[PDB]
Design a protein around this motif. Structure first.
Motif, mmCIF file in Angstrom:
data_model
loop_
_atom_site.group_PDB
_atom_site.id
_atom_site.type_symbol
_atom_site.label_atom_id
_atom_site.label_comp_id
_atom_site.label_asym_id
_atom_site.label_seq_id
_atom_site.Cartn_x
_atom_site.Cartn_y
_atom_site.Cartn_z
ATOM 1 N N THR A 1 -3.326 -1.065 -4.266
ATOM 2 C CA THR A 1 -4.576 -1.700 -3.658
ATOM 3 C C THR A 1 -4.344 -3.212 -3.050
ATOM 4 O OG1 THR A 1 -4.691 -2.691 -5.844
ATOM 5 C CG2 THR A 1 -5.528 -0.339 -5.462
ATOM 6 N N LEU A 2 -4.705 -3.221 -1.873
ATOM 7 C CA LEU A 2 -4.207 -4.445 -1.078
ATOM 8 C C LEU A 2 -5.108 -5.677 -1.629
ATOM 9 C CD1 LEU A 2 -2.509 -4.490 1.133
ATOM 10 C CD2 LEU A 2 -3.355 -2.128 0.669
ATOM 11 N N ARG A 3 -6.320 -5.340 -1.914
ATOM 12 C CA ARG A 3 -7.250 -6.879 -2.627
ATOM 13 C C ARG A 3 -6.970 -6.824 -4.003
ATOM 14 N NH1 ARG A 3 -11.946 -5.505 -3.160
ATOM 15 N NH2 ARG A 3 -11.978 -3.423 -3.260
ATOM 16 N N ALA A 4 -5.512 -6.950 -4.504
ATOM 17 C CA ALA A 4 -5.259 -6.889 -5.897
ATOM 18 C C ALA A 4 -4.643 -8.307 -6.553
ATOM 19 C CB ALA A 4 -4.329 -5.985 -6.070
ATOM 20 N N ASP A 5 -4.164 -9.165 -5.566
ATOM 21 C CA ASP A 5 -3.621 -10.283 -6.022
ATOM 22 C C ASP A 5 -2.537 -10.583 -7.221
ATOM 23 O OD1 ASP A 5 -3.310 -13.293 -5.798
ATOM 24 O OD2 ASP A 5 -5.225 -13.863 -6.657
ATOM 25 N N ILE A 6 -1.339 -9.727 -6.785
ATOM 26 C CA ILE A 6 -0.384 -9.479 -7.772
ATOM 27 C C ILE A 6 0.418 -11.114 -7.369
ATOM 28 C CG2 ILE A 6 1.896 -8.656 -8.207
ATOM 29 C CD1 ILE A 6 -0.790 -6.494 -6.554
ATOM 30 N N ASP A 7 0.903 -12.031 -8.445
ATOM 31 C CA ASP A 7 1.992 -12.920 -8.238
ATOM 32 C C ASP A 7 3.072 -12.278 -8.706
ATOM 33 O OD1 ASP A 7 0.428 -14.842 -7.169
ATOM 34 O OD2 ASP A 7 -0.142 -15.570 -9.294
ATOM 35 N N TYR A 8 4.243 -12.323 -7.917
ATOM 36 C CA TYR A 8 5.287 -11.558 -7.852
ATOM 37 C C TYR A 8 6.606 -12.861 -8.170
ATOM 38 C CZ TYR A 8 9.715 -8.662 -6.776
ATOM 39 O OH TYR A 8 10.757 -7.965 -6.989
ATOM 40 N N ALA A 9 7.519 -12.579 -8.998
ATOM 41 C CA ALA A 9 8.724 -13.335 -9.089
ATOM 42 C C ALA A 9 9.931 -12.707 -9.602
ATOM 43 C CB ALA A 9 8.181 -14.610 -10.068
ATOM 44 N N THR A 10 11.113 -13.065 -8.782
ATOM 45 C CA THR A 10 12.458 -12.858 -9.043
ATOM 46 C C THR A 10 13.196 -14.042 -9.584
ATOM 47 O OG1 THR A 10 12.447 -10.953 -7.676
ATOM 48 C CG2 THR A 10 14.664 -12.001 -8.053
ATOM 49 N N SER A 11 13.925 -14.015 -10.718
ATOM 50 C CA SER A 11 14.707 -15.075 -11.066
ATOM 51 C C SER A 11 16.145 -14.438 -11.500
ATOM 52 C CB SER A 11 13.998 -15.608 -12.462
ATOM 53 O OG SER A 11 14.465 -15.063 -13.643
ATOM 54 N N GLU A 12 17.076 -15.366 -11.707
ATOM 55 C CA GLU A 12 18.558 -15.337 -11.510
ATOM 56 C C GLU A 12 18.957 -15.957 -12.676
ATOM 57 O OE1 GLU A 12 21.431 -13.593 -10.168
ATOM 58 O OE2 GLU A 12 21.821 -14.495 -12.144
ATOM 59 N N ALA A 13 19.790 -15.074 -13.830
ATOM 60 C CA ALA A 13 20.044 -15.676 -15.140
ATOM 61 C C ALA A 13 21.698 -15.619 -15.134
ATOM 62 C CB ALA A 13 19.372 -15.097 -16.416
ATOM 63 N N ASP A 14 22.303 -16.567 -15.550
ATOM 64 C CA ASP A 14 23.933 -16.301 -15.586
ATOM 65 C C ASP A 14 24.135 -16.761 -17.085
ATOM 66 O OD1 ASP A 14 22.694 -18.945 -15.326
ATOM 67 O OD2 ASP A 14 24.418 -19.794 -14.211
ATOM 68 N N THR A 15 24.689 -15.606 -17.680
ATOM 69 C CA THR A 15 25.186 -15.453 -18.938
ATOM 70 C C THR A 15 26.651 -15.265 -19.091
ATOM 71 O OG1 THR A 15 24.706 -13.390 -19.406
ATOM 72 C CG2 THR A 15 22.983 -14.919 -19.901
ATOM 73 N N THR A 16 27.429 -15.751 -20.121
ATOM 74 C CA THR A 16 28.729 -14.989 -20.331
ATOM 75 C C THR A 16 28.969 -13.678 -20.425
ATOM 76 O OG1 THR A 16 28.533 -14.741 -22.803
ATOM 77 C CG2 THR A 16 28.720 -16.983 -22.142
ATOM 78 N N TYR A 17 27.750 -12.703 -20.314
ATOM 79 C CA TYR A 17 28.001 -11.457 -20.263
ATOM 80 C C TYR A 17 27.891 -11.181 -18.709
ATOM 81 C CZ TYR A 17 27.182 -10.605 -25.022
ATOM 82 O OH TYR A 17 27.591 -10.324 -26.350
ATOM 83 N N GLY A 18 27.476 -11.934 -17.908
ATOM 84 C CA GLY A 18 27.250 -11.708 -16.314
ATOM 85 C C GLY A 18 26.140 -12.224 -15.732
ATOM 86 N N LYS A 19 25.504 -11.479 -14.911
ATOM 87 C CA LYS A 19 24.335 -11.968 -14.036
ATOM 88 C C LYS A 19 23.327 -10.934 -14.142
ATOM 89 C CE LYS A 19 25.220 -13.575 -10.144
ATOM 90 N NZ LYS A 19 24.262 -14.838 -9.645
#
Lengths: 218, 164, 206
Positions: free
Chosen positions: C175-193
């Motif tokens: 649906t176009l009139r929906a106003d999703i706020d989207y976000a991508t974040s990056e986390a660096d741990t000792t296990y990896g990415k």
RNA sequence: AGGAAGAC
RNA sequence: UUGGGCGUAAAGGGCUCGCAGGCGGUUUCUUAAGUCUGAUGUGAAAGCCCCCGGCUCAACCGGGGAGGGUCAUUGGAAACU
RNA sequence: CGAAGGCGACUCUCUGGUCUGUAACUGACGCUGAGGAGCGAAAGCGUGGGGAGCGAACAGGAUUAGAUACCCUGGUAGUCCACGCCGUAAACGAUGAGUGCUAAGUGUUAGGGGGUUUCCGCCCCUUAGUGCUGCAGCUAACGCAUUAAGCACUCCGCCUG
RNA sequence: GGUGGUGCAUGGUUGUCGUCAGCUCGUGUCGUGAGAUGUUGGGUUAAGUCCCGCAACGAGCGCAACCCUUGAUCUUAGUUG
């Protein structure tokens, strides 16, 4: 009036025998109505529904016998007890959280159809919402204003509404039902053997019970 | 006879199990957790539940066990007589013991009986080792039992001439 | 082989841009310089957790407004950040700058802050499942209309990398009139990415 | 009631 | 035996006639072979167990009882085989 | 109908059983059965017949990469009779025999008895088969369920990855 | 600093089945259990799109609509037409 003499009681001799074992040879060829056991079973049903009026929640009826549904619906609306007139949805007693949140939506839509903003687009809201009201008000019945768990239940026919007594078995509701002779009366000692499809007989017995709780309410 | 929820229950889980299902894109994986729930005063039920998350299966199983409860005879902190719980190819032989032996039972059966609060029962598992079948067998066994006073009132006699 | 980015699909038709100006025949070096502002603001204000910055041109003056949803550990004595940012930004870009701050009431419905919250618990090394459930509970107790959360990578298992999803409510992405706020974040741990994608259906647009 | 057709 | 099974899991003989063998409807008298119960003599002593004593309980060493009998003679009971 | 294998044209001679009714008899003569004896589909073997059709083997024609096979054209032994033999089958209800209790509904085969008939049929008991649904109960499910795989008692056979 | 190896150590992107119409959950029933139901059946659609019976009642991602462009007209807006 308690006279009997109205119903023959059953269809032809492809029947489930439950009283077969100790009946001697009789020249009648069929059972005669046992008036003493009939009047004492009506008396104990009368005393039990006197107790039901003593807590005050009377009874809710279920049925799908279309020759009697409008009649038991108008009797329910006249005498104040509750009814299932159309098809009875499965799992009312166990999904009562879903049923109560659905009936909450009926309160919201039945207030917004008259108090809220009515015209935001002329036809689409009408053809969605009025049809949706008609579906739920025809498929839900007169179980709207309980706001509580039910206490007792009467069934038109155990064979026809077979799963209702299973739900009452699971959640331990005392049960009331008129049975035909093909049914199972072996479970509960409170039993009403009579013709399940004779409209005059079922109107006589439901009118007697409705007037019984009408004079029991005071 | 349904029992109300106005009791304190200890909801000690017995077993979870990794349960599969195969569909076109591979396997979907759920957890079936069965628990035993009951107070120490003589009421026991069991519960089962399937979920995609283990604590979700735990709360579903404890809700089912709160739904389904049954009461056991607890006269003299030990069962009145010998019995065999028989359901589903698990045969749990239950035998009362003297008051100091402690409960002698296999794992799921000891969980159920210790959660009941019995002190001294010798039991043997003569059937299969499937835990749900042991649970249903031992609950059928504990349901089968009956009071000495119940035997007295059904036979129309008193407890002293039942015992002697 | 995935969904197209919803903020990039909504911009221009329902979503207003985060930049409201025109540059002619110097468009390229204004994009290079104002992305230098945006990376510098991100690098020095990641502690203050900006949701978004938005800029405009004032005929060789630039106006910056920064959305941070808290004055508390951000403004200091009240003038410390504006002096230490305005003089530094003047030193970097060589142009007249002006800076203003804005706050978000009901502050748990902003997606960039939500993904930064998830990422922060991942360097805090609390369990990812607890992070998902706590953030779902936080967003519903703040109130919302739908949340979908995703974390992908090596989630503690070394030999396999798999994603986990947790959702509640309705999040229609179509649906176009929906106003999703989207976000991508990056986390660096000792296990990896580890990658976090959170997207929130806040409300409706008529 | 309307063709013979192998292996990974 | 206490303490498993045989339609599809391993497991019903292809089916019959029958010797020896294994079981046997009801009632009434009779014997006591099987059955149950006393008496006596035996199942040695050390061993296991029950109760006391000694080497700084102790491991052990002692003192007195319980039996590991389809055991032999004899008395009694007659419901069941 | 037969214990099982099995038995379908008709007639005759000889002969084995089974079921119903009676109450005139004897008065526990009964059940099961290791070894033993006797039957025992088809294929196979020996001797003597017979050989229409079908037909392993075998040969020709195709198809196929090959095709010692399916498919087509022939066709020996066999299949048939008498006398013997071998003694096996998914010889199956994949359910040993016997006896007794345990809800019903509905067909069919052979009877017996009753209600206005020695008339046609209509109903109700009643056995002895032979089916199909379907409780309690059993089972691990399928399923079985008065023709038990239910509840028991006796005897036999057999199993222990 | 490695445009050096490891995509089978990874996030981030992408194709594919495929614009195919399907994929699941909550509560509750049935099942010892894996599971099932809803989501099957009838009538139409391009569609799990709509509706009627139904131990199911609902919900979610999908489908369709809302978005853009091309398809006629009214008002306003006439230059650099």
């Amino acid at each position: 009036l308690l006279e009997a003499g109205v119903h023959f009681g059953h269809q032809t001799r492809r029947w489930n025998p439950k009283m077969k074992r100790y009946i001697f040879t009789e020249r009648n060829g069929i059972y005669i109505i046992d008036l003493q056991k009939t009047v004492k079973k009506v008396e104990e049903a009368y005393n039990f529904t006197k107790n039901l009026a003593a807590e005050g929640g009377k009874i809710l009826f279920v049925g799908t016998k279309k020759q009697a549904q409008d009649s038991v619906k108008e009797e329910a609306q006249r005498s104040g007890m509750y009814y299932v007139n159309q098809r009875w949805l499965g799992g009312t007693l166990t999904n009562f959280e879903t049923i109560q949140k659905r009936i909450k939506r009926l309160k919201d839509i039945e207030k917004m159809q008259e108090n809220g903003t009515f015209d935001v687009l002329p036809k689409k809201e009408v053809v969605q919402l009025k049809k949706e009201l008609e579906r739920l008000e025809k498929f839900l019945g007169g179980i709207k204003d309980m706001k509580d768990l039910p206490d007792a239940l009467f069934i038109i026919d155990p064979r026809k509404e077979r799963i209702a007594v299973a739900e009452a078995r699971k959640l331990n509701i005392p049960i009331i039902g008129i049975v035909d002779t093909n049914c199972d009366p072996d479970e509960i000692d409170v039993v009403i053997p009579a013709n399940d499809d004779a409209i005059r007989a079922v109107k006589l017995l439901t009118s007697k019970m409705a007037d019984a709780i009408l004079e029991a309410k005071q | 006879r349904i029992d109300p929820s106005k009791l304190e229950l200890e909801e000690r889980l017995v077993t979870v199990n990794r349960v599969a299902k195969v569909v076109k894109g591979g396997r979907r994986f759920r957890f079936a957790a069965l628990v035993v729930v009951g107070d120490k005063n003589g009421h026991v039920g069991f519960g089962t539940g399937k979920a995609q998350e283990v604590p979700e299966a735990i709360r579903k199983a404890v809700e089912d066990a709160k739904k389904n409860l049954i009461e056991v005879p607890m006269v003299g902190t030990t069962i009145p007589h010998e019995i065999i719980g028989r359901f589903g190819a698990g045969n749990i032989l239950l035998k009362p013991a003297s008051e100091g032996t402690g409960v002698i039972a296999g794992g799921p059966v000891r969980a159920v009986l210790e959660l009941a609060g019995v002190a001294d029962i010798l039991s043997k598992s003569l059937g299969s080792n499937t835990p749900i079948n042991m649970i249903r067998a031992t609950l059928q066994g504990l349901s089968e039992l009956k009071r000495a006073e119940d035997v007295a009132k059904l036979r129309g006699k008193s407890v002293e001439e039942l015992l002697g | 082989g995935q969904k197209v980015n919803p903020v990039g699909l909504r911009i221009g038709v329902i979503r207003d841009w985060e930049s409201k100006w025109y540059a002619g025949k110097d468009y390229a070096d204004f994009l290079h310089e104002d992305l230098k502002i945006r990376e510098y603001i991100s690098k020095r204000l990641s502690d203050a957790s900006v949701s978004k910055v938005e800029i405009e041109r004032a005929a060789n003056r630039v106006n910056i407004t920064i959305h941070t949803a808290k004055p508390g550990m951000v403004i200091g004595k009240g003038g410390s950040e504006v002096e230490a940012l305005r003089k530094a930004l003047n030193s970097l870009t060589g142009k007249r700058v002006h800076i203003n701050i804005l706050e978000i009431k009901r502050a748990d419905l902003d997606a960039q802050l939500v993904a930064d919250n998830i990422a922060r618990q991942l360097e805090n090394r609390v369990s990812f499942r607890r992070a998902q459930k706590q953030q779902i509970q936080r967003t519903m107790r703040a109130g919302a209309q739908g949340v979908k959360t995703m974390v992908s990578g090596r989630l503690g298992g070394a030999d396999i990398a798999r994603s986990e999803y947790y959702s509640e409510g309705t999040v229609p992405l179509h649906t176009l009139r929906a106003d999703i706020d989207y976000a991508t974040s990056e986390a660096d741990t000792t296990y990896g990415k580890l990658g976090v994608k959170v997207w929130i259906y806040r409300g409706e647009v008529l």
